[PDB]
Amino acid sequence: GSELSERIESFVETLKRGGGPRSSEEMARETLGLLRQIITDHRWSNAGELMELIRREGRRMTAAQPSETTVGNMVRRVLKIIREEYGRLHGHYAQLQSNIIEAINELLVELEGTMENIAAQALEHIHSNEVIMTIGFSRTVEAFLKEAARKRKFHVIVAECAPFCQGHEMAVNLSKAGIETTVMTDAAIFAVMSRVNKVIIGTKTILANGALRAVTGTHTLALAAKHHSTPLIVCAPMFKLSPQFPNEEDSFHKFVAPEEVLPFTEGDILEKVSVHCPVFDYVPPELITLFISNIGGNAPSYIYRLMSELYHPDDHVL
Amino acid sequence: GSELSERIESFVETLKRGGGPRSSEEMARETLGLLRQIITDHRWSNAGELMELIRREGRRMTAAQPSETTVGNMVRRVLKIIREEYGRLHGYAQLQSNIIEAINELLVELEGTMENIAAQALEHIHSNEVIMTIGFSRTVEAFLKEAARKRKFHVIVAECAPFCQGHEMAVNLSKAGIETTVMTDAAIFAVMSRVNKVIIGTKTILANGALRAVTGTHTLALAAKHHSTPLIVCAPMFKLSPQFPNEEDSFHKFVAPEEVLPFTEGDILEKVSVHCPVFDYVPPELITLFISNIGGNAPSYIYRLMSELYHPDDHVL
Ligand SMILES: O=C(COc1ccc(Cl)cc1)N[C@H]1CC[C@H](NC(=O)COc2ccc(Cl)cc2)CC1
């Protein structure tokens, strides 16, 4: 009642103001915790009432932050879990609720071991004396490289990000493990692409056609990798996979304050100028060669089947 | 007279039978020596008579071996030299000493082409590089073996399937310590994902920037264009020819098929058709840069060298 509504409002305001929390795995875990706290302290007679309640709350959760699609596709996965449970129990009040609770429990067990499965399958994608290229900062590709460097010797080129240098902390965290990290700017990508053997990156949201939104500057990196025919690796978990089509809905990129690009101490020229800072960039599926998740490797021409294994087409509008 | 005739006939037979001599530089030197020897002991009143005489002997020399056009383009170079000398003397008796000193300075230019390629080789090799090379030629071997004097890099040598000529190049580069790796011509696209740039040579550069070379390098250039790696053809100026590709279908030099399928195979050698082309055709769109003794040139610039070393009248010879 009161505790649920204040936790929902604090969740909406935390998604509205900034990045709370930092990692996406803790955000997915607190989304599962919010959904289970909602379903253990509510009353429903039919499964469609719970479906409409989760739809109404998920509309507010995507209206809080449209760029953060992790809560949206997590709500959609929970909705398809509700649909599968009602289908398997239709062909149901306490047994159904216990089945949904244990399904959310085993989903949390699956969610806790995504990074360890990606690090375990990292050994069959990295060979010795290799040139690795990574843009931005994410713990998935960092655990990938720091597990592949336990038995192999190779080189990682960590490119920073031009609005805010998020690759510097990743570079000083990888160089503590001794993987010979090379740091450069965003303008040298094609200027290093003649020597890069394989590009291994992460992403923010896997779209439905195999496309992906990610940190900005990686569409250029994927274009240079397609130009130089180097294979592209996406170390992404199974909660960054969303059915939101790119050209279907608006508000694709997340535009932030232009102070990180052009500071306020520039002068009188800040009135007659128009400075934009898109923190996210769109990459088409033809520039992607391989996705790597906890269940293994998949083609970009296979992601639809994962949709057919994780999402319902009636829940795409939410 | 007699000495000229027996030397010309011995040259025709040693170009008809096999590769005599071995490298292209010494046979270009002996071709220029044959041309100066056949111009010092003849009598002519007009330059057109010597033009037709050089044309007839060049027709005989290309009829000796059509795929070996170094003698043909050197005959064409001597023809353009006597053409420009008759043009600068026309606008009458001192022409012979002019052609002798022109052939002399051409031989001085031909003696110092590989050292010029080695001098300009320093701006194309960086440290900790990988290098792919197909076939065997002394130009790219000398290139790498002096570029490794100040740089540390790697050389991938892919052997040739008709004649395994990459082996002597691998053991000649490994004596200099360039960390060369020997492989077949079969994992080229299996290794093209790591090759940074490809240093090769050629046998004959055509007029449109295309080139014939040792076989398997058209596939290698297709892989280099697929991976967008720069292709560097280290070739001198006597390997430049105006012979267009679609010209009477006598492009490839077909050799005996025992190196592909031996004679001890059995009864299946009757009902099979085994071909062995030693040369292959590479279009100019798969080439990024040519390296000659005067420097580097685009494949979209070779026509100007065709306008600077040859004349369009002498293309039929
Ligand atoms: O040292 C580095 C660092 O890479 C970079 C670091 C920073 C930047 Cl900006 C650019 C590149 N990379 C090495 C990785 C092995 C490779 N190759 C070899 O050492 C051996 O070459 C071979 C040999 C055989 C085969 Cl089949 C393939 C490659 C050379 C370059």
XYZ file of C-alpha atoms and ligand atoms in Angstrom:
665
model
C 0.000 0.000 0.000
C 2.067 2.897 1.310
C 5.451 1.124 1.136
C 4.723 -0.147 -2.390
C 3.628 3.260 -3.686
C 6.594 5.093 -2.161
C 9.029 2.496 -3.543
C 7.405 2.806 -6.988
C 7.592 6.617 -6.835
C 11.223 6.533 -5.668
C 12.029 4.097 -8.497
C 10.347 6.382 -11.055
C 12.138 9.475 -9.718
C 15.498 7.657 -9.621
C 15.057 6.591 -13.246
C 13.938 10.140 -14.093
C 16.803 12.089 -12.516
C 19.965 10.100 -13.169
C 21.532 6.671 -13.374
C 20.372 4.841 -10.278
C 22.021 2.479 -9.735
C 25.295 2.427 -11.678
C 25.355 -1.133 -13.026
C 22.510 -2.516 -15.120
C 22.577 -5.862 -13.284
C 21.637 -4.258 -9.949
C 18.961 -2.274 -11.812
C 17.547 -5.516 -13.220
C 17.710 -7.147 -9.772
C 15.879 -4.240 -8.140
C 13.322 -4.360 -10.970
C 12.728 -8.055 -10.183
C 12.503 -7.140 -6.497
C 9.984 -4.377 -7.203
C 7.889 -6.720 -9.361
C 7.887 -9.481 -6.739
C 7.053 -6.964 -3.983
C 4.150 -5.802 -6.160
C 2.803 -9.295 -6.811
C 3.059 -10.582 -3.224
C 1.126 -7.586 -1.831
C -1.751 -7.294 -4.311
C -5.058 -9.023 -5.020
C -6.301 -10.347 -8.357
C -8.864 -12.875 -9.574
C -7.855 -13.291 -13.234
C -4.414 -13.185 -14.824
C -5.550 -10.427 -17.194
C -6.029 -8.081 -14.237
C -2.407 -8.680 -13.207
C -1.436 -8.201 -16.864
C -3.191 -4.822 -17.019
C -1.710 -3.767 -13.659
C 1.831 -4.630 -14.773
C 1.111 -2.890 -18.113
C -0.086 0.293 -16.373
C 2.938 0.336 -14.075
C 5.324 -0.439 -16.945
C 3.915 2.449 -18.976
C 4.985 4.774 -16.155
C 8.326 2.968 -15.845
C 9.107 3.543 -19.534
C 7.733 7.095 -19.347
C 10.226 7.760 -16.538
C 13.271 6.960 -18.704
C 12.657 5.849 -22.312
C 16.366 5.262 -22.977
C 16.594 2.737 -20.119
C 14.759 -0.151 -21.757
C 15.981 -2.737 -19.215
C 12.947 -2.194 -16.980
C 10.676 -2.299 -20.042
C 11.806 -5.611 -21.485
C 12.139 -7.030 -17.962
C 8.475 -6.134 -17.329
C 7.701 -7.709 -20.719
C 9.558 -10.911 -19.769
C 7.616 -11.035 -16.487
C 4.400 -10.550 -18.497
C 5.281 -13.458 -20.786
C 6.009 -15.527 -17.663
C 2.468 -14.658 -16.470
C 1.101 -15.638 -19.895
C 2.947 -18.978 -19.945
C 1.800 -19.795 -16.402
C -1.821 -18.961 -17.213
C -1.546 -21.067 -20.367
C -0.082 -24.068 -18.551
C -2.598 -23.777 -15.689
C -5.591 -23.054 -17.948
C -5.452 -26.139 -20.175
C -5.281 -21.159 -9.514
C -4.713 -18.562 -6.783
C -2.003 -19.835 -4.421
C -0.398 -22.487 -6.648
C -0.227 -20.016 -9.551
C 1.283 -17.345 -7.283
C 3.873 -19.808 -5.959
C 4.711 -20.807 -9.548
C 5.223 -17.146 -10.517
C 7.329 -16.610 -7.372
C 9.602 -19.587 -8.080
C 9.855 -18.537 -11.744
C 11.031 -15.088 -10.637
C 13.419 -16.819 -8.202
C 14.990 -18.988 -10.914
C 15.077 -15.938 -13.203
C 17.125 -14.173 -10.520
C 19.421 -17.223 -10.295
C 19.811 -16.987 -14.087
C 20.438 -13.232 -13.849
C 23.147 -13.611 -11.191
C 25.225 -15.904 -13.414
C 25.231 -14.104 -16.771
C 28.691 -12.559 -16.368
C 30.304 -15.789 -15.153
C 28.892 -17.699 -18.140
C 30.148 -14.996 -20.518
C 33.583 -15.145 -18.859
C 33.509 -18.956 -19.065
C 32.777 -18.864 -22.802
C 35.313 -16.051 -23.318
C 38.092 -18.637 -23.790
C 36.797 -19.835 -27.186
C 36.878 -16.343 -28.737
C 40.313 -14.935 -27.768
C 43.649 -16.201 -29.091
C 47.178 -15.212 -28.142
C 48.822 -12.045 -29.537
C 45.512 -10.437 -30.476
C 44.529 -6.800 -30.988
C 41.262 -6.045 -29.171
C 39.199 -2.883 -29.641
C 36.629 -1.767 -27.069
C 34.577 1.433 -26.829
C 33.065 2.800 -23.633
C 32.909 1.022 -20.292
C 30.924 -2.024 -19.206
C 31.626 -4.739 -16.653
C 30.658 -7.528 -19.079
C 33.449 -6.904 -21.599
C 35.808 -6.133 -18.694
C 35.148 -9.540 -17.117
C 35.437 -11.043 -20.625
C 38.914 -9.573 -21.139
C 40.114 -10.169 -17.569
C 39.133 -13.843 -17.790
C 40.583 -14.289 -21.285
C 43.864 -12.751 -20.075
C 44.272 -15.431 -17.383
C 45.686 -17.900 -19.929
C 46.284 -15.785 -23.063
C 48.534 -12.828 -23.866
C 47.011 -10.163 -26.104
C 46.500 -6.415 -26.474
C 43.374 -4.325 -25.875
C 42.868 -0.878 -27.405
C 40.394 0.835 -25.076
C 39.011 3.889 -26.860
C 37.619 6.600 -24.598
C 34.320 8.417 -25.119
C 34.366 12.044 -26.278
C 31.446 13.524 -24.227
C 32.780 11.990 -21.004
C 35.870 9.778 -20.853
C 34.391 6.587 -19.434
C 37.110 4.422 -20.986
C 39.840 5.727 -18.680
C 38.617 3.811 -15.624
C 38.246 0.689 -17.777
C 41.796 1.194 -19.064
C 43.283 1.604 -15.578
C 41.272 -1.404 -14.388
C 42.445 -3.611 -17.269
C 46.059 -2.452 -16.949
C 46.115 -3.651 -13.332
C 45.619 -7.166 -14.730
C 48.380 -6.606 -17.304
C 46.763 -6.902 -20.742
C 48.895 -4.097 -22.331
C 46.059 -1.589 -22.644
C 46.418 1.146 -25.281
C 44.380 4.333 -24.768
C 43.530 6.770 -27.567
C 40.808 9.200 -28.671
C 37.648 8.640 -30.729
C 39.085 10.240 -33.868
C 41.706 7.522 -34.472
C 39.315 4.565 -34.925
C 39.737 4.134 -38.677
C 43.308 5.344 -38.108
C 43.811 2.185 -36.023
C 41.398 -0.058 -37.946
C 44.104 -1.292 -40.343
C 45.733 -3.161 -37.421
C 42.751 -4.222 -35.275
C 42.207 -7.980 -35.453
C 38.863 -8.300 -33.646
C 36.436 -5.771 -32.168
C 34.836 -6.859 -28.884
C 32.320 -4.415 -27.386
C 29.198 -4.244 -25.270
C 25.875 -2.528 -25.807
C 23.008 -0.834 -23.980
C 19.956 -2.262 -25.778
C 19.672 -5.062 -28.341
C 16.887 -4.171 -30.769
C 14.507 -6.623 -32.416
C 16.048 -6.815 -35.904
C 19.520 -7.547 -34.519
C 20.330 -3.828 -34.376
C 21.629 -2.208 -31.213
C 21.779 1.128 -29.478
C 24.985 1.616 -27.510
C 27.416 4.296 -26.358
C 28.086 6.905 -29.006
C 30.892 6.412 -31.501
C 30.346 2.669 -31.937
C 28.320 3.011 -35.143
C 31.453 4.559 -36.650
C 33.485 1.705 -35.133
C 31.124 -0.884 -36.631
C 31.309 0.874 -40.011
C 35.111 0.757 -39.854
C 34.967 -2.916 -38.837
C 32.709 -3.643 -41.819
C 35.119 -1.699 -44.048
C 38.121 -3.676 -42.776
C 36.097 -6.955 -42.534
C 36.983 -7.591 -38.913
C 34.444 -9.613 -36.894
C 32.390 -7.864 -34.230
C 31.561 -9.371 -30.830
C 28.748 -8.146 -28.576
C 29.149 -9.271 -24.965
C 25.602 -8.556 -23.857
C 23.370 -10.300 -21.299
C 19.811 -11.446 -21.921
C 18.069 -8.495 -20.241
C 19.420 -5.907 -22.704
C 17.421 -7.578 -25.490
C 14.337 -5.528 -26.372
C 11.572 -5.763 -29.002
C 11.433 -1.977 -29.552
C 11.977 -1.363 -33.261
C 14.338 1.531 -34.210
C 12.218 3.633 -36.570
C 8.898 2.682 -34.938
C 8.898 4.760 -31.741
C 10.380 8.192 -31.116
C 12.881 9.320 -28.430
C 15.574 6.868 -29.517
C 18.738 8.679 -28.428
C 19.191 10.088 -24.928
C 20.222 13.730 -25.242
C 22.106 15.096 -22.236
C 23.471 18.497 -21.240
C 25.954 20.041 -23.717
C 28.323 21.153 -20.925
C 30.365 17.971 -21.411
C 30.853 18.845 -25.102
C 31.071 22.650 -25.044
C 31.614 24.266 -21.615
C 29.781 27.310 -20.300
C 33.005 29.382 -20.271
C 33.168 29.533 -24.077
C 31.911 33.105 -24.428
C 29.343 35.073 -26.422
C 29.247 32.419 -29.179
C 27.079 30.100 -27.055
C 23.907 31.982 -28.045
C 24.322 31.668 -31.832
C 25.324 27.976 -31.679
C 23.332 24.738 -31.401
C 25.221 22.049 -29.466
C 23.805 18.527 -29.277
C 25.185 15.589 -27.292
C 23.615 12.212 -28.138
C 25.033 9.738 -25.633
C 23.646 6.747 -27.583
C 24.177 5.625 -31.169
C 22.357 3.234 -33.491
C 24.117 0.282 -35.138
C 22.339 -1.704 -37.897
C 22.398 -5.528 -37.755
C 24.421 -5.891 -40.970
C 27.515 -4.460 -39.238
C 27.259 -7.038 -36.418
C 28.784 -10.502 -36.772
C 28.170 -12.260 -33.444
C 26.282 -11.760 -30.180
C 27.642 -13.409 -27.026
C 25.268 -14.069 -24.123
C 25.182 -16.505 -21.198
C 23.481 -19.155 -23.365
C 26.265 -18.900 -25.946
C 26.864 -17.294 -29.330
C 24.148 -16.219 -31.743
C 23.924 -14.580 -35.132
C 22.246 -11.180 -35.586
C 19.894 -13.113 -37.911
C 18.667 -15.185 -34.929
C 17.587 -12.586 -32.308
C 13.925 -12.829 -33.421
C 13.833 -16.429 -32.158
C 15.044 -15.188 -28.781
C 12.055 -12.834 -29.005
C 9.924 -15.910 -29.671
C 11.553 -17.484 -26.605
C 11.241 -14.431 -24.338
C 8.526 -11.998 -25.504
C 4.951 -12.041 -26.755
C 3.913 -9.918 -29.770
C 0.819 -8.723 -27.868
C 3.046 -7.090 -25.219
C 5.174 -5.023 -27.627
C 3.178 -1.831 -27.018
C 3.126 -2.274 -23.174
C 76.857 -10.281 -89.414
C 77.577 -13.868 -88.406
C 78.241 -13.141 -84.711
C 75.074 -11.016 -84.587
C 73.018 -13.793 -86.192
C 74.266 -16.550 -83.880
C 73.816 -14.379 -80.774
C 70.280 -13.426 -81.854
C 69.423 -17.070 -82.592
C 70.896 -18.218 -79.263
C 68.837 -15.528 -77.500
C 65.680 -16.688 -79.311
C 66.323 -20.336 -78.403
C 67.142 -19.574 -74.760
C 63.931 -17.548 -74.507
C 61.969 -20.293 -76.290
C 63.178 -23.305 -74.294
C 63.299 -22.172 -70.675
C 64.102 -19.335 -68.317
C 67.549 -18.206 -69.376
C 68.889 -16.341 -67.524
C 67.157 -16.472 -64.138
C 66.361 -12.964 -62.891
C 64.769 -10.205 -64.946
C 67.502 -7.618 -64.304
C 70.308 -9.582 -65.970
C 68.142 -10.523 -68.952
C 67.143 -6.866 -69.330
C 70.856 -5.997 -69.253
C 71.623 -8.587 -71.928
C 68.642 -7.391 -74.001
C 69.978 -3.822 -73.893
C 73.416 -5.195 -74.772
C 71.904 -7.079 -77.709
C 70.157 -3.900 -78.875
C 73.336 -1.820 -78.690
C 75.253 -4.622 -80.441
C 72.713 -4.731 -83.287
C 72.771 -0.939 -83.687
C 76.565 -0.475 -83.728
C 77.210 -2.738 -86.751
C 74.437 -1.773 -89.188
C 73.985 0.789 -91.953
C 70.978 3.083 -92.272
C 70.171 6.396 -93.944
C 66.840 7.230 -92.274
C 65.625 6.493 -88.754
C 62.526 4.717 -90.087
C 64.639 1.897 -91.520
C 66.175 1.259 -88.096
C 62.650 1.570 -86.658
C 61.370 -1.190 -88.962
C 64.478 -3.310 -88.282
C 64.022 -3.054 -84.496
C 60.295 -3.723 -85.061
C 61.020 -6.929 -87.006
C 63.484 -8.209 -84.400
C 61.019 -7.346 -81.633
C 58.281 -9.228 -83.492
C 60.641 -12.217 -83.633
C 61.473 -11.870 -79.927
C 57.806 -11.774 -78.897
C 57.148 -14.695 -81.251
C 59.840 -16.576 -79.310
C 57.860 -16.201 -76.064
C 54.619 -14.170 -75.910
C 54.216 -14.256 -72.126
C 57.731 -12.843 -71.564
C 57.287 -9.212 -72.593
C 60.323 -7.671 -70.856
C 62.282 -7.934 -74.110
C 59.262 -6.516 -75.952
C 58.845 -3.454 -73.764
C 62.602 -2.862 -73.758
C 62.550 -2.953 -77.576
C 59.632 -0.503 -77.314
C 61.653 1.700 -74.935
C 64.558 1.778 -77.409
C 62.005 2.629 -80.126
C 60.677 5.563 -78.097
C 64.266 6.667 -77.386
C 65.167 6.743 -81.087
C 61.802 8.418 -81.799
C 62.396 11.273 -79.348
C 66.007 11.618 -80.525
C 64.897 11.851 -84.162
C 62.291 14.387 -83.045
C 64.840 16.526 -81.207
C 67.333 16.247 -84.088
C 64.707 16.923 -86.782
C 63.346 20.220 -85.447
C 71.670 13.822 -88.774
C 74.949 11.941 -88.312
C 75.454 12.309 -84.533
C 72.327 10.284 -83.692
C 74.182 6.990 -83.150
C 76.379 8.273 -80.313
C 73.237 9.802 -78.777
C 71.472 6.426 -78.797
C 74.609 4.751 -77.381
C 74.837 7.207 -74.468
C 71.056 6.949 -73.958
C 71.336 3.148 -73.719
C 74.319 3.643 -71.379
C 72.410 5.920 -68.991
C 69.436 3.542 -69.256
C 71.758 0.752 -68.092
C 72.951 2.979 -65.225
C 69.282 3.528 -64.322
C 68.603 -0.216 -64.592
C 71.549 -1.159 -62.364
C 70.302 1.027 -59.510
C 66.578 0.290 -59.346
C 66.588 -2.254 -56.502
C 68.769 -0.018 -54.329
C 66.345 2.856 -54.992
C 63.405 0.649 -53.974
C 65.395 -0.305 -50.863
C 66.106 3.377 -50.170
C 62.423 4.316 -50.400
C 61.377 1.163 -48.506
C 61.876 2.862 -45.124
C 58.591 4.818 -45.345
C 56.431 1.697 -45.766
C 57.436 -0.625 -42.884
C 56.816 0.048 -39.190
C 57.752 -1.931 -36.100
C 55.741 -4.995 -34.991
C 54.122 -5.416 -38.408
C 52.983 -8.514 -40.272
C 53.767 -8.831 -43.980
C 52.277 -11.194 -46.557
C 54.227 -12.200 -49.662
C 53.367 -14.652 -52.434
C 55.884 -16.273 -54.752
C 59.552 -15.324 -54.925
C 61.382 -12.323 -56.325
C 64.676 -10.713 -55.370
C 63.067 -7.258 -55.173
C 60.701 -7.917 -52.260
C 63.267 -10.200 -50.589
C 65.897 -7.439 -50.659
C 63.146 -4.970 -49.611
C 62.324 -6.938 -46.458
C 65.912 -8.002 -45.710
C 67.121 -4.405 -45.528
C 63.920 -3.046 -43.965
C 64.534 -5.454 -41.075
C 67.900 -3.777 -40.400
C 66.200 -1.064 -38.321
C 62.663 -2.439 -37.837
C 61.310 -5.537 -36.101
C 58.350 -7.076 -37.913
C 56.983 -10.371 -39.220
C 56.794 -11.802 -42.745
C 54.203 -14.405 -43.755
C 55.429 -16.372 -46.780
C 52.746 -18.316 -48.642
C 54.135 -20.913 -51.034
C 53.034 -21.345 -54.641
C 51.307 -24.594 -55.595
C 52.770 -25.166 -59.152
C 56.347 -24.362 -58.123
C 57.093 -24.033 -54.393
C 59.232 -20.932 -54.827
C 58.328 -19.411 -51.447
C 60.639 -21.846 -49.655
C 63.918 -20.317 -50.842
C 62.561 -16.862 -50.026
C 61.608 -18.074 -46.541
C 65.059 -19.520 -45.870
C 66.679 -16.374 -47.319
C 64.585 -14.069 -45.122
C 65.066 -16.261 -42.044
C 68.845 -15.946 -42.409
C 68.355 -12.212 -41.806
C 66.045 -12.934 -38.856
C 62.709 -11.389 -39.850
C 60.581 -14.031 -37.994
C 59.118 -15.411 -41.204
C 56.245 -17.907 -41.068
C 55.847 -20.408 -43.901
C 52.342 -21.463 -44.891
C 50.527 -22.680 -47.974
C 48.438 -20.650 -50.398
C 45.382 -22.403 -48.944
C 44.847 -20.493 -45.677
C 45.179 -17.009 -47.227
C 41.660 -15.883 -46.363
C 42.140 -17.882 -43.158
C 45.058 -15.547 -42.343
C 43.810 -12.343 -44.034
C 41.953 -11.311 -40.853
C 45.337 -10.615 -39.212
C 47.446 -9.416 -42.171
C 48.075 -5.670 -41.903
C 49.525 -5.019 -45.366
C 50.695 -7.199 -48.246
C 54.061 -6.623 -49.938
C 54.258 -8.495 -53.262
C 55.984 -8.258 -56.610
C 54.800 -8.941 -60.133
C 55.951 -10.211 -63.520
C 54.371 -7.623 -65.837
C 52.429 -4.414 -65.190
C 49.828 -3.776 -67.881
C 48.729 -0.470 -69.399
C 45.524 0.033 -67.379
C 47.248 -0.493 -64.020
C 46.447 -4.216 -64.035
C 49.188 -6.791 -63.635
C 50.086 -10.354 -64.415
C 52.054 -12.073 -61.670
C 52.679 -15.494 -60.145
C 49.511 -17.511 -59.775
C 47.395 -17.234 -56.648
C 47.897 -13.492 -56.193
C 44.575 -12.548 -57.797
C 42.909 -14.515 -55.000
C 45.267 -12.837 -52.512
C 44.383 -9.404 -53.902
C 40.676 -10.269 -53.681
C 41.194 -11.149 -50.010
C 43.170 -7.927 -49.494
C 40.343 -5.910 -51.064
C 37.851 -7.805 -48.889
C 39.783 -6.896 -45.733
C 40.776 -3.434 -47.122
C 44.464 -3.968 -46.490
C 46.887 -1.936 -48.638
C 48.620 -3.886 -51.400
C 52.164 -2.801 -52.270
C 53.590 -3.983 -55.597
C 57.371 -3.506 -55.577
C 58.089 -3.619 -59.295
C 60.752 -1.908 -61.428
C 60.211 0.027 -64.654
C 61.266 -2.685 -67.120
C 58.281 -4.801 -66.015
C 55.902 -2.166 -67.433
C 54.165 -3.090 -70.681
C 51.382 -1.635 -72.865
C 49.841 -5.046 -73.654
C 46.142 -4.903 -72.817
C 44.527 -7.931 -71.062
C 41.850 -8.789 -73.645
C 44.284 -9.212 -76.539
C 44.227 -12.497 -78.535
C 43.706 -14.581 -75.314
C 47.452 -15.371 -74.996
C 47.634 -14.104 -71.419
C 48.670 -17.021 -69.214
C 51.776 -19.153 -69.667
C 50.676 -22.775 -69.381
C 53.381 -25.200 -68.272
C 53.604 -28.969 -67.887
C 51.003 -30.441 -65.491
C 53.315 -32.890 -63.711
C 53.755 -30.455 -60.818
C 49.977 -30.482 -60.291
C 49.227 -34.157 -61.010
C 52.232 -36.502 -61.370
C 52.641 -39.146 -64.053
C 52.463 -41.984 -61.482
C 48.758 -41.368 -60.816
C 47.414 -44.233 -62.922
C 44.727 -44.878 -65.532
C 42.775 -41.753 -64.496
C 45.246 -39.459 -66.285
C 43.595 -40.166 -69.655
C 40.057 -39.067 -68.717
C 41.183 -35.928 -66.839
C 42.147 -32.431 -68.016
C 44.883 -30.916 -65.837
C 45.870 -27.298 -66.519
C 48.693 -25.393 -64.823
C 48.829 -21.620 -65.395
C 51.874 -20.121 -63.696
C 50.614 -16.533 -64.137
C 47.462 -14.780 -62.965
C 45.649 -11.534 -63.751
C 44.997 -8.853 -61.121
C 42.758 -5.853 -61.963
C 43.912 -2.350 -60.938
C 41.031 -1.853 -58.478
C 42.615 -4.411 -56.125
C 45.953 -2.530 -56.187
C 46.648 0.401 -53.863
C 50.224 1.466 -54.658
C 53.093 0.615 -57.004
C 56.696 1.144 -55.883
C 59.256 1.849 -58.615
C 62.761 3.316 -58.428
C 61.414 6.861 -58.895
C 58.980 6.474 -56.002
C 55.416 5.429 -55.300
C 52.592 5.750 -57.806
C 48.868 5.137 -57.836
C 47.356 2.481 -60.123
C 45.422 5.444 -61.583
C 48.739 7.004 -62.705
C 50.418 4.153 -64.669
C 49.076 5.556 -67.976
C 51.317 8.603 -67.483
C 54.293 6.262 -67.255
C 52.817 4.709 -70.400
C 53.031 8.234 -71.818
C 56.551 8.741 -70.423
C 58.290 5.489 -71.426
C 56.377 4.183 -74.463
C 54.723 5.404 -77.653
C 51.205 4.385 -78.796
C 52.460 3.691 -82.337
C 54.762 0.893 -81.126
C 52.048 -1.001 -79.212
C 51.666 -3.577 -81.996
C 55.488 -3.853 -82.505
O 51.851 -5.506 -30.505
C 50.717 -5.349 -30.806
C 49.932 -4.167 -30.240
O 48.872 -3.860 -31.104
C 48.524 -2.502 -31.157
C 48.533 -1.721 -30.010
C 48.188 -0.381 -30.084
C 47.838 0.176 -31.303
Cl 47.394 1.901 -31.394
C 47.826 -0.602 -32.450
C 48.170 -1.942 -32.376
N 50.073 -6.275 -31.724
C 50.824 -7.405 -32.269
C 49.931 -8.647 -32.209
C 50.526 -9.840 -32.954
C 50.924 -9.479 -34.396
N 51.501 -10.642 -35.092
C 52.724 -11.362 -34.734
O 53.406 -11.057 -33.812
C 53.152 -12.551 -35.595
O 52.684 -12.371 -36.899
C 51.977 -13.455 -37.425
C 52.652 -14.626 -37.718
C 51.959 -15.705 -38.240
C 50.598 -15.612 -38.464
Cl 49.727 -17.018 -39.134
C 49.919 -14.439 -38.171
C 50.612 -13.355 -37.649
C 51.854 -8.258 -34.447
C 51.260 -7.062 -33.703
